[PDB]
Design a protein around this ligand. Structure first.
Ligand SMILES: *[C@@H]1O[C@H](CO)[C@@H](O)[C@H](O)[C@H]1NC(C)=O
Ligand SMILES: *[C@@H]1O[C@H](CO)[C@@H](O)[C@H](O)[C@H]1NC(C)=O
Ligand SMILES: *[C@@H]1O[C@H](CO)[C@@H](O)[C@H](O)[C@H]1NC(C)=O
Ligand SMILES: *[C@@H]1O[C@H](CO)[C@@H](O)[C@H](O)[C@H]1NC(C)=O
Ligand SMILES: *[C@@H]1O[C@H](CO)[C@@H](O)[C@H](O)[C@H]1NC(C)=O
Lengths: 229, 73, 319
C-alpha cells in the first residue's frame, strides 16, 4: 500500500509537470477553440468581400447608386454574404456533430472510467484500468486514468495442469509456474507463488488427455492433520 | 539536396537510410526530421522497436512488480 | 470489415475553377477566403484520415514477431501471419482482401485534384497488423496493457475460455478439437472472402463514393451553368473582359458552389469514416488487445480473441 500510494502521488505530480512542460498537451481543446475563431474570422472577413459587386460596404453602394440601379448590386452582396453564412452554419453543424461525438465519448468515459471500473482495454487509458479522475478544462474534460501497468516480468516454466494422482489438477485461478525445480501456483497478473494445494486447484479427469501436463505433488491441506492423528 | 518521395519531390532534405519515429509526416511512409552541422533528414518511418517475445510452449512471463501509471486523456 | 481511411484528396480552386486564367484568378481573390478555407477543410480531412489509420493500427509502439518455429499447440496461424515468401509481407487473407478491392484516380488528379498518399503506406500498415498479430499470439491480452509477456497460445486461449466462464480444463481436454475447429474456421474465412467478393462492400462503397464525388466534381467543369460556354479560354477569346466578366463570374460561382458541395459531402463522409475509424480503433483496443465481454461487439458469440487484417482503406477483424 505504501509503494502504491507513493507511485500514485508521483504519477499525479508527473501529470502536473507533463501538462506544465507540455502546453500543447491540450491541443485537442485548443484546436476546437482555434477552429471556432477561424470560422468566425472567416465569417467576418467575408463582409470585406464585394462578391462581384462594386464594394463590400452597403452604405457605399446606397450612397452612390440609384435604388433600382443598386438593386442588382445589393442582391449580389446578399447572395454572397448569405452563402458565406450558409457555409459557416454548415461547418458549425459538421463541427457540432464532431463535438457531440466527442462529448458522447467523454460522457461514456465519465460513466465507465470514473463512475466505475471498465474492463474495456485501452478505453480508460493504456494499462489495466484502476480508476479515473475527471478535470474540468475550457470547453472540455480531462480524465486522469489511473491504470495498473505490470512492470518487472520473469520467465517461468509453466504447465497447463498438474498430474498428481493420475488425475489432472488445473489452477482454480491463476497459472502454474516453476522457479526451475519447485512448482507453484500464482496469480495471472502478479508473481505471488503459492504451494499447489487442493484449494488452489480443481480436478478434471485422468491426466493423459491434456498435452503439456507435468507430474508434480498437489499438497493436500488436511493430510498433515492425518499425521497429527 | 533532391530526394524523390512517392509524395513528391523533396528538396533541401537529405535522404538517410536509417529509421526513426515520425517527426514531420511527408507521406507514403516517409517522414522528415531535423537531426544530424545539423540538417533536415527524410527517412522511412520506424514503426517501433523491433523485439520478438520469447514465446515457448512451456514458458510464461509474469510481472513481479508494477507501476501505477496515471495517464491523461 | 470496417472502413478506416479515405482517399486524401485535395482541391485547388485557382486551378480547379480556372487554370491559366489570371482574370479569373483575381476575380477569385475578389470572392475572398472561400478557397483558403476549402484547402483548409480538405487538409483537415487529410490529416484526420492519416490520424484515423494511426490510431486504429498504431496501438503498439513495439513491433513483435512470432517465433521462427510456429507451433502453438495445434493452432495454424499461417493463414493470418505474413508470408515470408511473397514480396508484399501480407497474409494470404490480407492478400485476398487486397485483390478483392479495386489509373482512374489520376484522371481527376489531372484536373487540379491532388490525391495525397496516406502517411502509413500499406506495407507499414501491414507491419502494424503483423505486430498486433504477433503480440496477440505470443503474449495475448497482456501486450496491450503494458509489457509483452509470453504465454503458451493454448494457455492464453485456455485463459480466454476462462474469460467466458468456461473452465480451462474444457480446452485442455478438447485442445485438438479446438485447434482443428480454429484452423477450419480460418480456412472458411479465406473461402468466404474468395467466393463472395461483395464481402468487402463496406470498403468498396467508400472507395466508390470517393470516386463518384470526385467524378461528379470533374463533370461539373463540363457544365456552363447558364453561361455561354463551360470553357473559359472560349469565353475570353470571343467576348470582352468587361463583357465576359458576367459570364466568367457565372462559371466561378457555379464551379465554386459545386466545389462547396463536394467539400461538404467529403466532410459528411470524413465524419462517417471518423465514426467507423473510432469504432475500428475501439475494436482493435478491446477485441484484439483484450477479450471483451461486450455481447455481439467482437463477433456473434462469446468472444475468445480477435485478429486484425489490413485491407485497402480499412481493417478486417477475424473475431
Ligand atoms: C524454488 O523455490 C523454493 C521456495 O519456494 C526454494 O526453496 C527452492 O530452493 C527453489 N528452487 C529453485 C532454485 O528452483
Ligand atoms: C514443449 O516442446 C518441447 C520440445 O521443443 C518438449 O520437449 C516439451 O516437453 C514440451 N512442453 C510442453 C508440451 O509444454
Ligand atoms: C509422469 O508419469 C507417467 C506415468 O504415470 C509417465 O508416463 C510420464 O512420463 C511422467 N511424466 C510426466 C507426464 O510428467
Ligand atoms: C526470457 O526473457 C528474457 C527477457 O525478455 C529474454 O531475453 C530471454 O531470452 C528469455 N528466455 C527464455 C528462455 O524465454
Ligand atoms: C497450415 O496449413 C497449411 C496447409 O493448409 C500448411 O501449408 C502450413 O504449413 C500450416 N502451418 C502451420 C503453422 O501449421
Amino acid at each position: 500500500q505504501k509503494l502504491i500510494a507513493n507511485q500514485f502521488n508521483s504519477a499525479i505530480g508527473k501529470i502536473q509537470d507533463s501538462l506544465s512542460s507540455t502546453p500543447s498537451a491540450l491541443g485537442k481543446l485548443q484546436d476546437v477553440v482555434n477552429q471556432n475563431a477561424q470560422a468566425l474570422n472567416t465569417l467576418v472577413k467575408q463582409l470585406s468581400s464585394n462578391f462581384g459587386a462594386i464594394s463590400s460596404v452597403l452604405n457605399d453602394i446606397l450612397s452612390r447608386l440609384d435604388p433600382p440601379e443598386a438593386e442588382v448590386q445589393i442582391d449580389r452582396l446578399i447572395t454572397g454574404r448569405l452563402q458565406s453564412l450558409q457555409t459557416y452554419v454548415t461547418q458549425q453543424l459538421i463541427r457540432a456533430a464532431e463535438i457531440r461525438a466527442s462529448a458522447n465519448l467523454a460522457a461514456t468515459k465519465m460513466s465507465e472510467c470514473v463512475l466505475g471500473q471498465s474492463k474495456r482495454v485501452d478505453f480508460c487509458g493504456k494499462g489495466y484500468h484502476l480508476m479515473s479522475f475527471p478535470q474540468s478544462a475550457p470547453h472540455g474534460v480531462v480524465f486522469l486514468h489511473v491504470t495498473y501497468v505490470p512492470a518487472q516480468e520473469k520467465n517461468f516454466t509453466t504447465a497447463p495442469a498438474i498430474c498428481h494422482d493420475g488425475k489432472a489438477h488445473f489452477p482454480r485461478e491463476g497459472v502454474f509456474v516453476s522457479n526451475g525445480t519447485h512448482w507453484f501456483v500464482t496469480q495471472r497478473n502478479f508473481y505471488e507463488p503459492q504451494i499447489i494445494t487442493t484449494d488452489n486447484t480443481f480436478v478434471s479427469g485422468n491426466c493423459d488427455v491434456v498435452i503439456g501436463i507435468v507430474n508434480n505433488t498437489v499438497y493436500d491441506p488436511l493430510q498433515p492433520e492425518l499425521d497429527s492423528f | 539536396n533532391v530526394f524523390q518521395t512517392r509524395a513528391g519531390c523533396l528538396i533541401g532534405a537529405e535522404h538517410v537510410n536509417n529509421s526513426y519515429e515520425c517527426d514531420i509526416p511527408i507521406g507514403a511512409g516517409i517522414c522528415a526530421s531535423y537531426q544530424t552541422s545539423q540538417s533536415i533528414i527524410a527517412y522511412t518511418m520506424s514503426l517501433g522497436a523491433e523485439n520478438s517475445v520469447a514465446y515457448s510452449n512451456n514458458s510464461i512471463a509474469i510481472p513481479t512488480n508494477f507501476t501505477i501509471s496515471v495517464t491523461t486523456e | 470489415i470496417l472502413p478506416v481511411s479515405m482517399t486524401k484528396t485535395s482541391v485547388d480552386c485557382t486551378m480547379y475553377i480556372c487554370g491559366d486564367s489570371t482574370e479569373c484568378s483575381n476575380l477569385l481573390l475578389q470572392y475572398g477566403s472561400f478557397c483558403t478555407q476549402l484547402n483548409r477543410a480538405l487538409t483537415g480531412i487529410a490529416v484526420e484520415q492519416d490520424k484515423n489509420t494511426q490510431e486504429v493500427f498504431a496501438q503498439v509502439k513495439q513491433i513483435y514477431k512470432t517465433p521462427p518455429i510456429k507451433d502453438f499447440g495445434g493452432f495454424n496461424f499461417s493463414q493470418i501471419l505474413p508470408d515470408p515468401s511473397k514480396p508484399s509481407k501480407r497474409s494470404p487473407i490480407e492478400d485476398l482482401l487486397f485483390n478483392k478491392v479495386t489509373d482512374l484516380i489520376c484522371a481527376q488528379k489531372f484536373n487540379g485534384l491532388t490525391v495525397l498518399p496516406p502517411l502509413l503506406t500499406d506495407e507499414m500498415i501491414a507491419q502494424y497488423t503483423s505486430a498486433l498479430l504477433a503480440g496477440t499470439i505470443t503474449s495475448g491480452w497482456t501486450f496491450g496493457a503494458g509489457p509483452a509477456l509470453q504465454i503458451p497460445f493454448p494457455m492464453q486461449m485456455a485463459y480466454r475460455f476462462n474469460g467466458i466462464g468456461v473452465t480451462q480444463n474444457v480446452l485442455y481436454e478438447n485442445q485438438k478439437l479446438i485447434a482443428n475447429q480454429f484452423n477450419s474456421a480460418i480456412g472458411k474465412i479465406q473461402d468466404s472472402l474468395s467466393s463472395t467478393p461483395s464481402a468487402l462492400g463496406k470498403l468498396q462503397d467508400v472507395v466508390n463514393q470517393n470516386a463518384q464525388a470526385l467524378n461528379t466534381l470533374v463533370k461539373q467543369l463540363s457544365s456552363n451553368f447558364g453561361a455561354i460556354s463551360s470553357v473559359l479560354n472560349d469565353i475570353l477569346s470571343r467576348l470582352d473582359p468587361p463583357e465576359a466578366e458576367v459570364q466568367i463570374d457565372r462559371l466561378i460561382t457555379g464551379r465554386l458552389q459545386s466545389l462547396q458541395t463536394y467539400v461538404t459531402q467529403q466532410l459528411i463522409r470524413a465524419a462517417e469514416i471518423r465514426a467507423s475509424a473510432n469504432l475500428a480503433a475501439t475494436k482493435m483496443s478491446e477485441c484484439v488487445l483484450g477479450q471483451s465481454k461486450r455481447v455481439d461487439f467482437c463477433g456473434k458469440g462469446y468472444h475468445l480473441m480477435s485478429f486484425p487484417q489490413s485491407a485497402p482503406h480499412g481493417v478486417v477483424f477475424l473475431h
